[PDB]
């Protein structure tokens, strides 16, 4: 591995496609190794751009645009932060010699539930929830019919629980199908798990390594809190890793992956996977020697991970206000930091509704205490408009 | 404590005067809190400018120049990273309402050896080496004869051991003086024979004075080569060291992290000098603590409470200090400089012309001895070319 000096002619260049808070930390980790960072997004002043060398505002769903910025910047690595990109142009660019992290196929399979679900379920023969894909309400209707209640319906091209609907009644169908169209879907058979985890799996030169399992709390399709390590059976864990390894290897390429699983007893079920750092993984900003962000960069740059140290019970708790403003201020911060307590404020230029503006990070003697400590600090911050 | 959003009208603005690798980290820590950062230095593309919202290049020794840029960016805080700045204007600005970190007086006192030495030694009555100042070659010679041999002569305005001579005899008098003139006034200090020296990273915050675990370091030709933490010391030495550090920081005044340099002779501690800001030897904290010295400085000067500092066990830093002339430096064999319990930092410095710290290797282990070896080893693996 040979790295140049940022801004100099031999500099190594990283293009970030998506400049939110996750991209912001990858940017910091690149900066730490003197890697040149170009932050791209669909709006100006996205958090990653504050810390990048330069930025571009584009319609990332626009392949030609994507091609134009890439071509212009000639990056060594292209790192997408989100799903909402023209993965087709990624494939081409890759085919053309660009290094897409972890690999372009990976991005593609994961932006569509059909791909990923089929791969895992069918191709890899892994435990997942019961499901069915539908192209028409009739079929939708037909499908929900076969899955039963309750059931989840999601757009094959959805995230943050967008267009999704939890179905316990035939009456929602009308709207359910409509939401899911707001035109193909999946109907999944609700799983009754003890808890949900994120298994942060890094694929690198020295193989696949796992971070301690990350548990978390979702609400209204937003993770609220995450913690590490989530208490799991040795057997349960062994199984989770097996599934994660098969999947990551199956998708291919070096990088940090967020493998979403459900745990019931010693039983593990595959849900989905992010071919990049996952929001729940923000707890690794205080819980490990190497954050998920640092791991992603180490991996993609072709460097060996070797090992991941975990520092005890730890937690993250989001700062998720809901208001409209283009001039947010945060008061009472002195009560949101302290021993074994930190906070991050993203630099997002405005908000109009519900948005994640920062996160509180905490460590403690117990996972439970870590969670309270983190929750309490996020809650002391007064978000003003 | 109220913080705005960077780039927004109510943004909280921080101006860094000096954009080196130390400033770089301070900038990342500000950015992590959505703090707006303007990086200033005497050359372009300096490390911290890589991560700043905006950058300017001026003569920071020029009071007028300084005032212009402050007028132009209207920062809430002015954060000096080096000694060579218009301290007299800082004072003005601080009176004109600007927050100089930790304070403008602390900055004036420490910009020259005389200010800080007389304060510590005379006003604070802290233990220090014997010393004598001199402004002529003859007075220089008079000071040596009074101080005796061996002794060390140093220019009053300097750092990273520039123009310093470890004088063992009269033979060296002449060259010593000349070289000293190369880096006016000089200091002649008596040689302290300590067991080891430390940097005690002291944080003055709204909630008091906090101490990081002692950092030991090894110096060579003006540059620190390795640093490690914690450095073992008796309980008594640790207490005396913390008493000294608390006195000096409070005496200097203001919130921030300070780098208190001490010599340790068994249970006795002697004051050497102090950085009114993060210290290069403290880079080990980038791997060894929950909050690096940079995260700490920011926390403190923003007026937030520290609460406390977590130390993760034995660790060390080892500099990447090549010697070459280039404006396009590259680093190879990187795959053999990082791994389990092993990391590196590459600063992004635009050029080199001789010896210059371009990065640092960091490692943790079960003992400082193993950490240091691991870290020197990794730094050594890096193939610097240009
Ligand atoms: N079959 C299922 N059984 C039980 N809970 C489910 C099921 N599918 C989803 N969930 C829950 O819903 C959350 C979001 O479901 P996802 O399928 O991950 O949706 P998404 O829109 O892709 O959200 P992201 O991308 O993970 S943020 C999960 O984290 C679970 O809490
Ligand atoms: N009186 C003294 N006795 C014995 N050793 C000394 C004495 N003064 C300095 N040294 C040694 O020389 C090193 C450099 O001295 P400094 O006074 O710190 O020089 P410097 O130019 O200010 O370097 P910086 O500011 O730390 S980068 C110290 O870290 C000690 O190792
Ligand atoms: Cl004197
Ligand atoms: Mg998803
Ligand atoms: Mg999910
Ligand atoms: Mg000095
Ligand atoms: Mg010194
Ligand atoms: Na001040």
Curated annotation (Swiss-Prot), chain A:
Keywords: Acetylation, ATP-binding, Ligase, Magnesium, Metal-binding, Nucleotide-binding, Purine biosynthesis. It comes from the Bacteria. GO terms for cellular component: cytosol. Disruption phenotype: Mutant defective in both purN and purT requires an exogenous purine source for growth. GO terms for biological process: 'de novo' IMP biosynthetic process. InterPro entries: ATP-grasp (IPR011761), ATP-grasp_carboxylate-amine (IPR003135), ATP_grasp_subdomain_1 (IPR013815), PreATP-grasp_dom_sf (IPR016185), PurT (IPR005862), PurT/PurK_preATP-grasp (IPR054350), PurT_C (IPR048740), Rudment_hybrid_motif (IPR011054). GO terms for molecular function: acetate kinase activity; ATP binding; magnesium ion binding; phosphoribosylglycinamide formyltransferase 2 activity; phosphoribosylglycinamide formyltransferase activity. Homodimer. NCBIfam families: PRK09288.1, purT. This is Formate-dependent phosphoribosylglycinamide formyltransferase. It comes from Escherichia coli (strain K12).
